[PDB]
Amino acid sequence: VQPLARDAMAYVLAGGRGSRLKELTDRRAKPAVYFGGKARIIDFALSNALNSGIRRIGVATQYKAHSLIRHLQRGWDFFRPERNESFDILPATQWYEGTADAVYQNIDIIEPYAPEYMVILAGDHIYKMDYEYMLQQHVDSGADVTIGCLEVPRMEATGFGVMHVNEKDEIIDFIEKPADPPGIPGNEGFALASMGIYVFHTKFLMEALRRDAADPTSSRDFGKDIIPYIVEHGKAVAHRFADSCVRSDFEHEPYWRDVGTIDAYWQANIDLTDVVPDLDIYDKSWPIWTYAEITPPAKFVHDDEDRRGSAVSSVVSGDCIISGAALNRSLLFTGVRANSYSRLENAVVLPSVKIGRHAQLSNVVIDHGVVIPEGLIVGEDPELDAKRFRRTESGICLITQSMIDKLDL
Amino acid sequence: VQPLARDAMAYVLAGGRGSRLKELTDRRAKPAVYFGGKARIIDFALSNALNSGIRRIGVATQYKAHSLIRHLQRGWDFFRPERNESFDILPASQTQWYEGTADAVYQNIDIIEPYAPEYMVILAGDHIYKMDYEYMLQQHVDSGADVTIGCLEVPRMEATGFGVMHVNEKDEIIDFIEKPADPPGIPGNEGFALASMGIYVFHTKFLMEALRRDAADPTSSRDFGKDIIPYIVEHGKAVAHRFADSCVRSDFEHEPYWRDVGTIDAYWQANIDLTDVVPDLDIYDKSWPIWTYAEITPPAKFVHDDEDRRGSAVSSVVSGDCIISGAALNRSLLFTGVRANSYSRLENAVVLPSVKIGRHAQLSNVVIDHGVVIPEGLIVGEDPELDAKRFRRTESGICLITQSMIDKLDL
Amino acid sequence: VQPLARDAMAYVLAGGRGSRLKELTDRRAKPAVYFGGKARIIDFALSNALNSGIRRIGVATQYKAHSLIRHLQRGWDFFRPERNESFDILPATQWYEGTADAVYQNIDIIEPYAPEYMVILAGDHIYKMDYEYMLQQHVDSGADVTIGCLEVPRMEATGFGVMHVNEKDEIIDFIEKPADPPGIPGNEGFALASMGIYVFHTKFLMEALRRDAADPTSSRDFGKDIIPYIVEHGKAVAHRFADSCVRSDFEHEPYWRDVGTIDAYWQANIDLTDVVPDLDIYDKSWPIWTYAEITPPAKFVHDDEDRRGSAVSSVVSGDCIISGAALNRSLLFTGVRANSYSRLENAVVLPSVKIGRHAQLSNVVIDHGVVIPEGLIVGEDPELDAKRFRRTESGICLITQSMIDKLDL
Amino acid sequence: EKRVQPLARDAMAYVLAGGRGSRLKELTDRRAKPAVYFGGKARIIDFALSNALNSGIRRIGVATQYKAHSLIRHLQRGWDFFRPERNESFDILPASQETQWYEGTADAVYQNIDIIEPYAPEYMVILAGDHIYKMDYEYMLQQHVDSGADVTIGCLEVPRMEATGFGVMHVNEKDEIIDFIEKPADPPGIPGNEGFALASMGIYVFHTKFLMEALRRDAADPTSSRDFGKDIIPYIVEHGKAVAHRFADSCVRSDFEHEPYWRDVGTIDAYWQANIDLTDVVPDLDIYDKSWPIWTYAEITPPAKFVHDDEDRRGSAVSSVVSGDCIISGAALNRSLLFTGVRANSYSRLENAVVLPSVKIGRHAQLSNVVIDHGVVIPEGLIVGEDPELDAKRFRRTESGICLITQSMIDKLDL
């Protein structure tokens, strides 16, 4: 009779340590990692909730949340309770004992709002999805939990929490990374991979997590304790990402990215420099909100036979001054200073980085605020680079300031 | 002890047609004209008021002000009355419009009175400059003047096109002259003259009766520069305040910066000079920021790198949400949202927001109005007689391009 | 599945004079008249749009617009275009030569948004409605216009532009203020009363308006020209208020008021003093947004035999100081200051009113900011009362500052 | 130089808000003292924040600690209007920057040097965030640079009998501090005017340069309790120059406030008194002074509604202060102060009651000389203020007969 997103509350689990992103997540959680030239990773789930019409949002934080909390304070500050909206930042006596405990310790935050539906969201993935489709299916199916799932070729799901399904898209088994992922009935060769997105009726959810906290035997996680429990003792249904995903007209397939490794993080950002990227960051119909300040425009200067500031096949944010520096196939976040006779290629450059004169960097990820000393060469000597910085097996160097300062060169 | 701006209300006069900007001000008052890549002209005076600590701002607008008013509604929306801040947009009505710039104040006494400020800072809303108004506020009460007037220190040859302040040894105004052929020089500093910036400071009580006396005078032109100021220069006490004293000069600004941008060449030159390696105006300054209306936009993007086409910008300023797809930019300033397409070329171009450049177009020495769609293959800057017959072209060689003109050509 | 509000624009008509409110609207448009103790009239239509899910709103203004426009600038300032929200104030040859011209002159504001549906609203009524219902009837009905109608007893409708329908609620004729109004077939005694709420497909509305500006015989009005044009040539289906009205559990009937006359304005505000008011201003599930400031609480002072500052069976806003004044069956907006030995009864007191000592006013509407001189008496001399101020037949006095200024006797 | 621009442009206010409100007992059990409500809408911390705002300080940092959940949430929702590109900043700084908490009140600044120094403020204004007072810090800033002092301290001029509970500053003819004693049993006196002493408000103005010096060389010394008044301040009064700034010179008074207002509300009786005092005809604190307004977090709420007038119930407030969204239904209120959302029902009576937000007073309940905690649902027929011995056993009753009532005591309730 009315749209269901009115009665929904998005609960964002943003306690991801990153870990596999190494120094990139040393002083910040993975949802706080920058992506795309402007936003952060957590901005996609939050914008999905906003654009789906969900007016109540909770975000549970955990590992090194100081930068994430400050981002959510400064950027997602426009919710007003008297308009029936709310944005609750819910940081962790001591740590949360998992991710279902992240919902248990904040019952007294949710239950005052009395939402009828809770949309449990992973806050460390890049994707655009209309959660109204997932809410309608949860009501129409009468399930205890609806789980969003990717349709992935049956060889990529080997590194995924895979749900096996029958012909009515009801989940009959969950397997953590099966060696031979079970396929879709009548559509073998594709398996359903878990997105970490679950829809519950709130009364059912409050009861389920409460039983979990009364189980000293439990690890207090949705995927290892809660989700297997309804899969076996109850009713679980799968929601396919392709049904809910919001595709631009310049998007060639449903887009979802885990950016779990340094190589995957690098590839997802550099792919935005392509002629027609997989992710349309120019889409106005399903916009991504984030914290942004009014910045001066980007500037390209110098044009001698010695030095020319210019960008080619590149994405350049505002407040960037490209002073006699050559940029090719590079993505620059806000406020980057590149100085004369320097050159960057295949570089993901996080905000407020300064490139010293005569430096030459190839196939790199430069962390926030790093000052690259004058004349530094990266991407030329693999063994020297693997000694000075963190180098992936395909030649991408993660460069942090603590690596830079520990060089007598 | 206490700062004077706490008890001051900046009153910005924003009803300037800027007639000599021609089609650039067709449907837009001069304070609403875009400048510098992101801001509009009126944002400088308002940002000077804010950064000087003046928490009450009134903006008087006149002709074709819908786009200016919407800018003020959207960009300057953060003032809170219960924190003793206010931002009043005061368009003419609430019999015709404002009879003059002094009537612009007079019609709005009942807006000014409830605030009861002790000082009134009358600002021109159509100039580009940075200034700390507390210095001027400080000189006013220490001088006992009836009005303090902000003045540029310009060489006498260039002061001939200004309203010039004749000043004695105490910088007291003994005569005001409209565009003198031989401008009176500063005593002891001949060769320089004092040119009015249109910045005034009054005690609010003094100002209210002046404009009320001006309103009860049928002879009056109802204008500050013609009726109120020349009245004080001879019957009251008028003192000049020197812009060099109060100008907020960035460390990378070689001189006090003030631009009128009163003609198309002057508007073009002021914008295009921000592409210098060291510009006169520092748009990367944080100590005295210029606030404006801005939205979150995607970054600028450059695509294609062939021998046929290469998207790139050299010696240029490029705002966000600009897609430079196989287009070659040189010495150009692009506002937000520009789409430049394959095989096109821009040189010495000021390109206002949301302009599309079609493939194979080549434009040199241009000002392209907001939202203009340049047809594919158009050439500007190559045939002066053809460009002048097609567009508004200055005698210096700069074309102003509007969509009306583009729609008016088979050729 | 998708809510239709996501793709609609609410276009509020707020250029009304409210002439039978007399000096209450001498310097304000009727949509800017205060109502309820904190809000103004137009806030209800705007809140209905916001709560229905509509985030693109345009408000056309005309007569006495400054305080209305200043109200919209500072109260409805939280919309952000890059979140696909918009709020346009449209005071945009002289004025609006009608009401259909109010849209025609602002097509250049509308069709760039390219909304799929237009919801044309009257901005001078007090009501709570979910516009998703009428949108969800419009696109299923396939009509060229859905018109919101109140089902009123047939002798109330004599002041309405009345339409009658068949068994399928299809509008066959439109009669403006019928002396003997046509009743609904089958169940007569009641009639459909048009509320001035129109729903269109945007592409249809644009043509209907441009063909209405083509005809020179046109008064350029919806209800007078375009609306009767479609029921004669196109398809119109009425929509019943009771199906869409948002009623609290404490509102015993669908609430809608016109407050067209001073007596009707007084009545609607004073009825809020009831124990069980017809309008529940405490319904948080459909809240009315307005311009509001942080204000001090209400203060009640003095308690002697001669003076006692207190309010009984009244509604008192913040920043109100009831100092030795006795209030009874009154409603006070923010900022009122009633001083010692004064007495108010059956009074609607607009913001910032000052009641001097010993003043005793009864059955009045006091205009915004009026200073009541000490010892003034109203309500005891019906003959003297009509001579100083404006008295209705029922004996309600509207008091403005100008009436007080001219008071010798 | 200048001598024209205000010093506040180059200052940053650092609000210490990590206190426990020790003697407020159950009122600060799940709130820090800066988060305790005061006045009818605002919380205690809003006064120091508003003083900084209205003084011209656009850079604020708030250090939190003990049970900071609702305090931090209050700061996120209310104090959210600062924009860094306008040279404004509001930093919420919880104690997670190391080992457990902040070692002290000076540790709260040293742990956050990395946030302070990029701003590069010229002057540091250290504020206690648990006092009710209105003050223009610009007077203190300008005094600091004309004095050449190392630290300037805000001081209350109180009779020496009352200065026995404060940190007392011993000054000379030039109000230059000679000594500091922690709560002297017989405090020293001011030259030219003894019978009075200078008591520390906990307000310190530093040159940021030297403060960073004093804080870094205070972390690397295990002799220090890592506090300003206990460790930093006494160091300067000995090795440098410490000057006393008197609240009477910078206090912002209304036309309706007859004396420099400063309250500590450190106990339940003091807290109850400070709120009830607002119901007086001429209050000591003028909450209607719009020249120095107190900003806080507030929502659009419905008005206050009074209803019923029979022979035995009449909803009415007398000599009281009633906030919005209050429905006084057949309830009589006298000498009370009600925050937001309070629901008082028929035949109930309140006298001398400070009623925090969203309290519900049940029918026939009669309460006298009480402080009711936020959200407490008073059961029907409850009688408080009638039986001193039984009220003392059921609730937190003060030595002067004020009962603090929390929900943790309404549930635990018997004969």
Question: In this structure, are residues D373 and D339 in contact, taking their beta carbons and an 8 Å threshold?
Answer: no
Distance, in Å, from the CA atom of A246 to the CA atom of C60, rounded to the nearest integer, reads 34
- Asked whether the beta carbons of residue C77 and residue B81 sit closer than 8 angstroms, the reply is no
Can you tell me which residue has the tokens 């003020």?
B72
Chain-chain contact of D324 with C317 (C-beta, under 8 angstroms): yes
How far is it, in rounded angstroms, from Cα C278 to Cα C268? Answer: 9
Q: Domains of chain C (ranges plus CATH)? A: 1-282 (3.90.550.10), 283-409 (2.160.10.10)
Closest-CA residue to D382 (of D408, D352, D360, D358): D360
Q: Which of A66, A70, A293 shows the shortest C-beta gap to D96?
A: A66
Q: Please, which residues bridge with residue B176 across strands?
A: B165
Pairwise CA distance, residues A138 & A132, whole Å: 10
Distance from CA of residue A62 to its chain's centroid?
Answer: 16
Which residues does chain D have within 8 Å of residue C308's beta carbon, measured at their own beta carbons? 318
* Helices C66-75, C42-52: crossing angle, 10 deg rounding: 30
Residue D303 and residue D319 in contact, taking contact as beta carbons nearer than 8 Å:
no
* Largest pairwise CA distance in chain A: 73
Two structure tokens written together for D160: 């020496």
To the question of whether residue C194 is assigned a binding role by annotation, the answer is yes
Q: Which residue of C has its CA nearest to D320?
A: C300
Shortest Cα distance, chain B CAs vs residue D132, angstroms: 18
Interface residues of chain B, partner chain C, Cβ below 8 Å: 66, 70, 73, 77, 80-82, 88-89, 94, 295-297
The nearest CA of chain D is from the CA of B276 a distance in Å of 24
Whether cis (ω within 30° of 0) applies to the bond prior to B94 is yes
CA nearest B48 in D: which residue? Answer: D86
Closest of C125, C126, C130, C224 to residue C175, by C-alpha: C224
- The rounded distance, in Å, linking the Cα atoms of A355 and D248 is 54
Query: How many angstroms separate the Cα of C228 from the Cα of each of C147, C174, C223?
Result: 11, 6, 7
**Å between D291 CA and nearest CA of chain B:** 7
| β-bridge partners, B89 | B59
Out of A296, A302, A312, closest to residue B284 by CB? A296
**Among candidate residues B198, B201, B220, B219, the one with its CA nearest the CA of residue B211:** B220
The answer to whether A203 is annotated as binding is: no
B73 → closest Cβ in C80, C89, C294: C89
Contact D97 A294 (CB under 8 A): no
Identify whether the C-beta of residue C368 lies closer than 8 Å to the C-beta of residue C351. yes
**What is the β-pairing status of strands D366-372 and D383-384?**
parallel
Touching subunits for chain A (3+ Cβ pairs under 8 A): B, C, D
Partnered with residue A57 across adjacent β-strands are: A10, A87
Chain C residue closest in CA terms to B296: C82
User: Closest approach of chain B CAs to the CA of D231, in angstroms?
Assistant: 32
Q: Neighbours of C (≥3 Cβ pairs closer than 8 A)?
A: A, B, D
Query: How far is Cα B99 from Cα B92, in angstroms, rounded to an integer?
Result: 9
Q: Answer yes or no: do A289 and C78 touch at CB < 8 A.
A: no
**C146 and C237 in contact (C-beta within 8 Å)?**
yes
Phi and psi (nearest 5°) for C242? -60, -25
Report the DSSP beta bridge partners of residue C122: C13
d(CA C301, CA C299): 6
Q: Are B136 and B120 in contact (CB under 8 A)?
A: no
A95 contacts: CB under 8 Å, gap ≥ 6 = A62
Question: Cβ of B2 and D295 within 8 Å?
Answer: no
State how far the alpha carbon of C115 is from the alpha carbons of C84, C201, D194, in Å.
11, 9, 77
Rounded CA-CA distance B104/A335 in Å is: 42
- CA separation, residue D320 to residues A343, B214, C40, D338, D402 (Å): 72, 51, 29, 8, 18
* CA distance, residue D299 to nearest chain A CA (Å): 6
Q: Which residues on A lie below 8 Å from D92 (Cβ)?
A: 70, 73
CB contact under 8 A, B132 and D293: no
Contact C82 A136 (CB under 8 A): no
| CB nearest to D309's CB, from C38, C313, C317 | C313
CA distance D58 to C165: 64
Q: Classify the C-alpha dihedral A92-A93-A94-A96 as positive or negative.
A: negative
Of A381, A379, A380, residue with least CA distance to A397: A379
Chain breaks in chain D (C to N over 2.5 A) after: 97
Quick one: tokens of B68?
A: 């200016």
Contact between A310 and B312 using a beta-carbon 8 Å cutoff: yes
Mutate to test the interface with C, among A6, A47, A76, A85 (most CBs of C within 10 A): A6
Residue whose pair of structure tokens reads 């600091």 in the numeric block: D144
What is the 8-class DSSP label of residue C403?
Answer: H
| CA distance to partner chain A, nearest, from residue C136 (Å) | 10
In the block, tokens 């950064």 appear at B51
Of A273, A275, A302, the CB nearest to B277: A302
CB atoms within 10 A of CB A45: 29
Residues annotated in a binding site of D for alpha-D-glucose 1-phosphate: 102, 167, 182-183, 200
Give DSSP secondary structure letters for C223-241: IIIIHHHHHHHS-EEEEEH
Helix (H) or strand (E) holding D210: helix D208-219
Cα of B249 to nearest chain D Cα, Å? 14
CA atoms within 13 A on the CB side of A379: 17
For residue B295, the distance in angstroms to the closest alpha carbon of chain C comes to: 7
One-letter amino acid at D56 equals G
Contact B84 D9 (CB under 8 A): no
Of D6, D86, D142, the CB nearest to B53: D6
Q: How many CB atoms lie within 10 A of CB D262?
A: 18
Chain mean position to CA B18 = 10
DSSP string, A20-64: TTGGGGSSS-GGGSB-TTS-BTHHHHHHHHHHTT--EEEEE--TT
- Count CB-CB contacts under 10 A for residue A113: 16
Point out the residue among D4, D85, D86 whose CB comes nearest to the CB of B138: D4
B59 burial via Cβ count (<10 Å: 0-12, 13-18, 19+): buried
Which among C53, C130, C284 has CB closest to A53? C53
Nearest-5° angle of CA A48, CA A51, CA A57?
65
List of residues 6+ apart from A82 with CB closer than 8 A = C284, C287, C289, D299, D300, D301
CB C277 within 8 A of CB C271: yes
Which run of H or E residues covers position D271? helix D268-276
DSSP string, C245-298: B---TT--S--EE---SHHHHHHHHHGGGSSS-SS-TT-TTS---------PPE
User: Which chain D residues touch C352 with a CB distance below 8 Å?
Assistant: none
Query: CB-CB: which of B66, B88, B297 is closest to C92?
Result: B66
How far C117 CA lies from chain A's nearest CA (Å)?
Answer: 16
Is A96 assigned a ligand-binding role in the annotation? Answer: yes
Element (H, E) at D329: strand D327-329
Taking the CB of residue C5, how many other CB atoms lie within 10 A of it? 24
Please, are residues B369 and B385 in contact by the beta-carbon 8 Å criterion?
no
B321 neighbors B336 (Cβ within 8 angstroms): yes
Please tell me the distance from the alpha carbon of residue D234 to that of residue B332, in angstroms, as a whole number: 61
> In the structure encoding, which two tokens stand for residue B291, read together?
């606030």
| Resolution value, angstrom units | 1.8
**Element (DSSP H or E) covering residue D119:** helix D113-119
End-to-end CA distance of chain B: 68
Residue partners of A80: CB distance under 8 A and separation at least 6: C78, D299
Whats the size of chain A, residue-wise?
409
Method for structure elucidation: X-ray
Among B295, B304, B314, the strongest candidate for a mutation testing the A interface, having the largest count of A CBs within 10 A, is B314
Which residue in this structure is represented by tokens 């209705």? C392
With beta carbons less than 8 A apart as the criterion, state whether B68 and B32 touch: yes
Q: In Å, how far from its chain's centre is CA D350?
A: 26
Six token digits for residue B237: 């006490």
Closest CA to B314 of A335, A360, A298: A298
Which residues in C have their CB inside 8 Å of a CB on D? 37-38, 273-275, 281-282, 287, 289-290, 292, 294-303, 308-318, 321, 332
Q: For an interface test with A, which of B271, B295, B315 has the most A Cβ atoms less than 10 Å from its Cβ?
A: B315
Count Cβ atoms below 10 Å from residue B276 Cβ, excluding itself: 12
* D-chain residue closest to A91, CA distance: D69
C161 labeled binding residue: yes
Question: Which residues in chain C are closer than 8 Å to D305, comparing Cβ atoms?
Answer: 314-316
